[PDB]
RNA sequence: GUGUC
């Protein structure tokens, strides 16, 4: 199967890279563009849908200077993985403590 | 020090024809060193200018004293201490429509200059020799700062 | 005086009689020339918090502090579709003697949700209609009307 | 060996309507297979066909011989046929929604940031643009906030990159020209594009509208080649609508509501009009109303009170404009000129 | 409904169709979307080169 | 489901399979998935008695409490949470400069309401894992891509 | 049995006919506060030229009725006014005329301007695209003249 | 003959 493709610009060899993601929507596009805009080494980053009856998303990444656009992608993706991991870890403990406290105060 | 123009202005009128926008307003200024009419638009939400205030206006290029002229502007990088940290309002626009005074049909020496900061208009009038540079096509940075005394 | 309205512009969102100002979320590096924000992960961990307001039989109300709209909207979007569950797909009707349509009956039966744990069941391969034991649940329905 | 295969993408296929009056009612486009079981095409080319998009069923033809496949591409070409032989005005510029979006984008009131600018120009690299580097123009106002100006977003459609040699130059006025100044206007209704970048003015029905001269795409096609006019017509249809959808444009019943200070303004007019018109009756009965035109008694009375009724409506409509807000959706559409006019506002 | 401008002028064509139109602002100026059901019926003859 | 009469019979056998809500609406595991920004009501000047009692009625009940203490009839914000935004303060322009409505853009109130298939407190915890399921599957192939 | 698709003609019972455009899933179609999604998106650009004011009044009356719980009369040269109905829409807690605070879904950001929400009686018409669709390459010909 | 553009 085809997960992701890479389209590099004719002029810029490793400065303007467009990743083509298959079978995805604006969910992973907006979170990823946020995570990459959090990075200070990125100039232009943006996702767009090819067609509403399709599932191909073009996501462009540009870095200020001479730096490949593949590293910030995985960097932001791992940072988002850690963010959701921590969000789940805190939510589980909050739910647990609230539930045990409610059960205690009820009976 | 590539200073194209610098002076101290005072606001006489502000937004005379009612109010149309919610973030931009017209400004009418005047000077004391050289007789000149300066009109520009500034953001009220960011820079809340009021009536009867004195500010300092500087039009120049090449913020950094080190470099001759640089290629691209970087937002957080501060390699060279520029003039923007000392002031409090920065714009980057270009000049166009170099025309003069048309009221005086015979000999006059009053020249005007129009600048467009990507939508916001600026009109300057004044002496011929006071305007030393101000070429037809020039990328110029505007610098404004409040002077409260 | 103006710096205060500046930090308040990005913190809270003002509501007017017509139109809403300060809508876009600006907390990225290079935007503001007074502060710096690149990741601050360890600082973000101590600023984020979750609370539970109300928890009912089939409704949960919770609160998230210190988070943007992007990941929250992603959560809300994937809560609907990407979370799988079980539902009726295929229907064999033996003898339909009534007024309702067979297609409408199948649609209304598929609209019926099922109290089952979808974690134990697998995902069906590309295609098979015979039905294995691990990825298909059988249900029977039979009723005929008689006089009293 | 002759082989007949199915319709593939990249075919010169004719698409037209049945009520043909002019010669631009039939055109040839490139075919595209899409599984939705319906005909789909761009809205900009809807004016040549004069479709209404509610009950229209258009037809489609397929050339069979290779000799005719090349003749329908050079003569009946969408890029070639953009002006009409009747007068010479460009017929394919824009429709109501795109005009309204382009007007709301450039208002000398919109202010973006570094992040939203990268998203508005993110929906513009979709086609032959993936192998093209896009540039970020220098920001105007950055001492405090480094925020972006919405008028510089619109200048990207003209010059998307550094390699594209597009240098447009237009200087004209709008439909709301206040006067008393050529480019120091009060409502900024004066467009001045220099070196393919917007300097002043807001885009209205007279600048990029269909059925008008001094048009953006028209001047772009006259100065440069015609291929650059069609590549920049679809870039606007992908930039304006998404921004308009994310901004929010709506109309309710609160928009059209009479002001309390307006009800007594027209009450005076109606009372004075009635008091003045109901006098000419007994004036004619007594024998009066000296006549300038050669006519009969009832004819002069028919037009003497006909000008008394239009004054009430005109004065009411003119006093209503000072009573409305600056965000009224019907008034906004009237100022833009997409679908509506001041007559409809004064009538509603 | 004659033979001069009814048949000779008319001469109803083949390899054609007609369908209701719908908007799609995701194509170019010279593009049009054709359903696959119609594309399967229509055929275009061409000779095989090398 | 259906209505029968004397002389009618219905017999069906349905198959239940696993699916995601993006395929069909019947595979939606949650009935309502929504959130709300935290409200904020900030007063500017001290109000008088009747103005306070009239402002208490302009809002939803239980927002602005009128404290009457021995000389004063002041208004006080106690709980702005239970307040549906109707912005009815701009109806009468008599006060018009007493309230400021805002939304704190780091506070989110999520209210999940499940149909009854699974507890709603587990749906949010599963959505977090589903969000990273793809962030991991993309890195899985990026590993092989950068391996070359 | 048929389902609505792209190319079907619908009406608004107010002289406003149109074919369907894009079929949008539920992740889009923003909710305002409670989680109510737009069932059919209407364009505000066809209102001024057509000059139809009864549509907004009917929407307002229908919303007030479904909130209160009684049918509102809308007969010609009478019925109900817009003075007693809007003051009744305040008792519940909504805005008085038409406006609500919406939160865009594709981005996750609020909308600057307010959107007009409400229930409307729509009707489905004939002339589906399923029957208004024809294509022919080589078929039968007439015996008098060899023509389609 | 009816219905739509």
From Swiss-Prot, chain B:
Domain of life of the source: Eukaryota
Cellular localisation: Nucleus; Nucleus, Nucleolus
Keywords of the record: Acetylation, DNA-binding, DNA-directed RNA polymerase, Nucleus, Transcription
Non-specific ssDNA binding: annotated segments: 15-39
GO CC term, one of those recorded: RNA polymerase II, core complex
Pfam families on file: RNA_pol_Rpb8
GO molecular function: DNA-directed RNA polymerase activity; single-stranded DNA binding
Any one GO BP annotation for this protein: transcription by RNA polymerase II
Coiled-coil intervals: none
Name this protein carries in UniProt: DNA-directed RNA polymerases I, II, and III subunit RPABC3
InterPro entries xrefs: NA-bd_OB-fold, RPABC3
Organism the protein comes from: Homo sapiens
Subunit structure: Component of the RNA polymerase I (Pol I), RNA polymerase II (Pol II) and RNA polymerase III (Pol III) complexes consisting of at least 13, 12 and 17 subunits, respectively. Pol I complex consists of a ten-subunit catalytic core composed of POLR1A/RPA1, POLR1B/RPA2, POLR1C/RPAC1, POLR1D/RPAC2, POLR1H/RPA12, POLR2E/RPABC1, POLR2F/RPABC2, POLR2H/RPABC3, POLR2K/RPABC4 and POLR2L/RPABC5; a mobile stalk subunit POLR1F/RPA43 protruding from the core and additional subunits homologous to general transcription factors POLR1E/RPA49 and POLR1G/RPA34.
N-acetylalanine carried by residues: 1
Family: Belongs to the eukaryotic RPB8 RNA polymerase subunit family.
UniProtKB/Swiss-Prot annotation, chain E:
Domain of life: Eukaryota
Annotated binding of DNA template strand, by residue: 5, 12, 18
Location within or outside the cell: Nucleus; Cytoplasm, Cytosol
Its job: Catalytic core component of RNA polymerase III (Pol III), a DNA-dependent RNA polymerase which synthesizes small non-coding RNAs using the four ribonucleoside triphosphates as substrates. Synthesizes 5S rRNA, snRNAs, tRNAs and miRNAs from at least 500 distinct genomic loci. Pol III-mediated transcription cycle proceeds through transcription initiation, transcription elongation and transcription termination stages. During transcription initiation, Pol III is recruited to DNA promoters type I, II or III with the help of general transcription factors and other specific initiation factors.
Entry's disease: Leukodystrophy, hypomyelinating, 7, with or without oligodontia and/or hypogonadotropic hypogonadism: An autosomal recessive neurodegenerative disorder characterized by childhood onset of progressive motor decline manifest as spasticity, ataxia, tremor, and cerebellar signs, as well as mild cognitive regression. Other features may include hypodontia or oligodontia and hypogonadotropic hypogonadism. There is considerable inter- and intrafamilial variability.
Similarity field: Belongs to the RNA polymerase beta' chain family.
The protein, known as: DNA-directed RNA polymerase III subunit RPC1
Organism: Homo sapiens (Human)
Gene that encodes it: POLR3A
Span of the entire protein shown here: 349 to 398 of 1390
Curated annotation (Swiss-Prot), chain F:
Localization per Swiss-Prot or TrEMBL: Nucleus; Nucleus, Nucleolus; Cytoplasm, Cytosol
Top-rank taxon, per record: Eukaryota
Function (record text): DNA-dependent RNA polymerase catalyzes the transcription of DNA into RNA using the four ribonucleoside triphosphates as substrates. Common component of RNA polymerases I and III which synthesize ribosomal RNA precursors and short non-coding RNAs including 5S rRNA, snRNAs, tRNAs and miRNAs, respectively. POLR1C/RPAC1 is part of the polymerase core and may function as a clamp element that moves to open and close the cleft.
Record's subunit section: Component of the RNA polymerase I and RNA polymerase III complexes consisting of at least 13 and 17 subunits, respectively. Pol I complex consists of a ten-subunit catalytic core composed of POLR1A/RPA1, POLR1B/RPA2, POLR1C/RPAC1, POLR1D/RPAC2, POLR1H/RPA12, POLR2E/RPABC1, POLR2F/RPABC2, POLR2H/RPABC3, POLR2K/RPABC4 and POLR2L/RPABC5; a mobile stalk subunit POLR1F/RPA43 protruding from the core and additional subunits homologous to general transcription factors POLR1E/RPA49 and POLR1G/RPA34.
Family assignment from sequence similarity: Belongs to the archaeal Rpo3/eukaryotic RPB3 RNA polymerase subunit family.
Protein name: DNA-directed RNA polymerases I and III subunit RPAC1
Organism per entry: Homo sapiens
Residues of the full protein shown: 199 to 346 of 346
Curated annotation (Swiss-Prot), chain G:
Chain residues that bind RNA: 9, 17, 132
Source domain of life: Eukaryota
Cellular localization per UniProt: Nucleus; Cytoplasm, Cytosol
Quaternary structure, from the entry: Component of the RNA polymerase III (Pol III) complex consisting of 17 subunits: a ten-subunit catalytic core composed of POLR3A/RPC1, POLR3B/RPC2, POLR1C/RPAC1, POLR1D/RPAC2, POLR3K/RPC10, POLR2E/RPABC1, POLR2F/RPABC2, POLR2H/RPABC3, POLR2K/RPABC4 and POLR2L/RPABC5; a mobile stalk composed of two subunits POLR3H/RPC8 and CRCP/RPC9, protruding from the core and functioning primarily in transcription initiation; and additional subunits homologous to general transcription factors of the RNA polymerase II machinery, POLR3C/RPC3-POLR3F/RPC6-POLR3G/RPC7 heterotrimer required for transcription initiation and POLR3D/RPC4-POLR3E/RPC5 heterodimer involved in both transcription initiation and termination.
Family to which this protein belongs: Belongs to the RNA polymerase beta chain family.
Protein name per Swiss-Prot or TrEMBL: DNA-directed RNA polymerase III subunit RPC2
Organism phylogeny: Eukaryota, Metazoa, Chordata, Craniata, Vertebrata
Gene behind the chain: POLR3B
Whole-protein coverage range: 888 to 1035 of 1133
């Amino acid at each position: 199967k085809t997960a992701l493709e890479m389209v590099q610009a004719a002029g810029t060899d490793r400065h303007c890279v467009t990743f083509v993601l298959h079978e995805e929507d604006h969910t992973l596009g907006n979170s990823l563009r946020y995570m990459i805009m959090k990075n200070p080494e990125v100039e232009f980053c943006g996702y767009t849908t090819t067609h509403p009856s399709e599932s191909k998303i073009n996501l462009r990444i540009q870095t200020r200077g001479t730096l490949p656009a593949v590293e910030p992608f995985q960097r932001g993706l791992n940072e988002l993985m850690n963010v959701c991991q921590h969000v789940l870890d805190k939510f589980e403990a909050s739910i647990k403590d609230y539930k045990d406290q409610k059960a205690s105060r009820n009976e | 020090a590539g200073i194209l123009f610098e002076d101290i202005f005072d606001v006489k009128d502000i937004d005379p024809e009612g109010k149309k926008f919610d973030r931009v307003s017209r400004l009418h200024c005047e000077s004391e060193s050289f007789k000149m009419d300066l009109i520009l638009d500034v953001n009220i939400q960011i820079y809340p200018v009021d009536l009867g205030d004195k500010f300092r206006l500087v039009i120049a290029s090449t913020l950094y004293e080190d470099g001759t002229l640089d290629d691209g502007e970087y937002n957080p990088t501060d390699d060279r201490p520029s003039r923007a940290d000392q002031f409090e309002y920065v714009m980057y626009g270009k000049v166009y429509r170099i025309e003069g005074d048309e009221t005086s049909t015979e000999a006059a020496t009053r020249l005007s200059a129009y600048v467009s900061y990507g939508g916001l208009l600026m009109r300057l009038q004044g002496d011929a020799n006071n305007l030393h540079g101000f070429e037809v096509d020039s990328r110029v940075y505007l610098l404004m700062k409040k002077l409260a005394f | 005086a103006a710096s205060q309205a500046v930090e308040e512009m990005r913190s809270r969102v003002v509501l007017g009689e017509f139109g809403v100002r300060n809508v876009h979320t600006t907390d990225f590096p290079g935007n503001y020339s007074g502060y710096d924000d690149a990741w601050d992960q360890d600082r973000f961990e101590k600023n984020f918090r979750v609370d539970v307001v109300h928890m009912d039989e089939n409704s949960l109300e919770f609160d998230m502090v210190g988070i943007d709209a992007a990941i929250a909207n992603a959560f809300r979007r994937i809560l609907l579709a990407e979370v799988p569950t079980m539902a009726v797909e295929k229907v064999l009707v033996y003898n339909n003697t009534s007024i309702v349509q067979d297609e409408i009956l199948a649609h209304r039966l598929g609209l019926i949700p099922i109290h089952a744990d979808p974690r134990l069941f697998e995902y069906r391969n590309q295609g098979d209609e015979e039905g294995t034991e691990i990825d298909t649940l059988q249900f029977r329905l039979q009723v005929r009307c008689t006089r009293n | 060996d002759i082989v007949e295969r199915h319709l593939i993408d990249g075919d010169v296929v004719l698409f037209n309507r049945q009520p043909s009056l002019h010669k631009l009612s039939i055109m040839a486009h490139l075919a595209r297979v899409k599984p939705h079981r319906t005909f789909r095409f761009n809205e900009c080319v809807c004016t040549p066909y004069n479709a209404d998009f509610d009950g229209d069923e258009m037809n489609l033809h397929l050339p069979q011989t290779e000799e005719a496949k090349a003749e329908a591409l050079v003569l009946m070409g969408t890029k070639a046929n953009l002006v009409t032989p009747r007068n010479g005005e460009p017929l394919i510029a824009a429709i109501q929604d795109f005009l309204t979006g382009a007007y709301l984008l450039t208002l000398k009131d919109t202010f973006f940031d570094r992040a939203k600018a990268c998203q508005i120009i993110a929906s513009i690299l979709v086609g032959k643009d993936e192998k093209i580097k896009v540039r970020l123009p220098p920001p105007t106002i950055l001492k405090p906030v480094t925020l972006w100006t919405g008028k510089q977003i619109f200048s990207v459609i003209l010059r998307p990159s550094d390699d594209n040699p597009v240098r447009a130059n237009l200087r004209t006025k709008g439909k709301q020209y206040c006067g008393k100044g050529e480019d120091l206007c009060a409502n900024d209704s004066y467009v001045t594009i220099q070196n393919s970048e917007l300097m002043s003015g807001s885009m209205d029905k007279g600048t990029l509208g269909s059925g008008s001269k001094n048009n953006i795409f028209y001047i772009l096609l006259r100065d440069w080649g015609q291929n650059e006019a069609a590549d920049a017509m679809s870039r606007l249809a992908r930039l304006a609508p998404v921004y308009l959808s994310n901004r929010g444009f709506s109309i309710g019943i609160g928009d059209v509501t009479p002001g309390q200070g307006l009800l007594k303004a027209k009450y005076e007019l109606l009372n004075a009009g009635y008091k003045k018109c109901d006098e000419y009756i007994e004036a004619l009965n007594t024998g009066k109303l000296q006549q300038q035109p050669g006519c009969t008694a009832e004819e002069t009375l028919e037009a003497l009170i006909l000008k008394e009724l239009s004054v009430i409506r005109d004065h009411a409509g003119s006093a209503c404009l000072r009573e409305l807000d600056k965000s009224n959706s019907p008034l906004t559409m009237a100022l833009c000129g997409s679908k509506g006019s001041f007559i409809n506002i004064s009538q509603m | 409904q004659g033979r001069f401008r009814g048949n000779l002028s008319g001469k109803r064509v083949d390899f054609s169709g007609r369908t209701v139109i719908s908007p799609d602002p995701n194509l170019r100026i010279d593009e049009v979307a054709v359903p696959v059901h119609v594309a399967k019926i229509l055929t275009f003859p061409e000779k095989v080169n090398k | 489901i259906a209505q029968l009469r004397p002389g009618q019979e219905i017999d069906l056998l349905m198959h239940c399979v696993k699916g995601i809500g993006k395929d069909h609406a019947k595979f939606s595991p949650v009935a309502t998935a929504s959130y709300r920004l935290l409200p904020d009501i900030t007063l500017l000047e001290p109000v008088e008695g009747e103005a306070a009692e009239e402002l208490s009625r302009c809002f939803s009940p239980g927002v602005i409490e009128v404290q009457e203490v021995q000389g004063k009839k002041v208004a006080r914000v106690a709980n702005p949470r239970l307040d549906t935004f109707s912005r009815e303060i701009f109806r009468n322009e008599k006060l018009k400069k007493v309230v400021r409505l805002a939304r704190v853009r780091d506070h989110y109130i999520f209210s999940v309401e499940s149909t009854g298939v699974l507890p709603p407190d587990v749906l949010v915890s599963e959505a977090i894992k589903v969000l990273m399921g793809k962030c991991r599957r993309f890195l899985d192939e990026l590993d092989a891509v950068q391996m070359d | 049995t048929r389902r609505p698709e792209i190319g079907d003609k619908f009406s608004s019972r107010h002289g406003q006919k149109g074919v369907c455009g894009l079929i949008v899933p539920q992740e889009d179609m923003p909710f305002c506060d409670s989680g109510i999604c737009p069932d059919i998106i209407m364009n505000p650009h066809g209102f001024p030229s057509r000059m139809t004011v009864g549509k907004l009044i009917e929407l307002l009356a229908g919303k007030a009725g479904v909130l209160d719980g009684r049918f509102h009369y809308g007969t010609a040269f009478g019925g109900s006014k817009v003075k007693d109905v809007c003051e009744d829409l305040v008792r519940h807690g909504y805005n008085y005329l038409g406006k609500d605070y919406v939160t865009s879904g594709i981005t996750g950001e609020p909308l600057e301007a307010y959107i007009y929400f409400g229930p409307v009686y729509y009707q489905k018409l004939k002339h589906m695209v399923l029957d208004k669709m024809h294509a022919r390459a080589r078929g039968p010909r007439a015996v008098l003249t060899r023509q389609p």
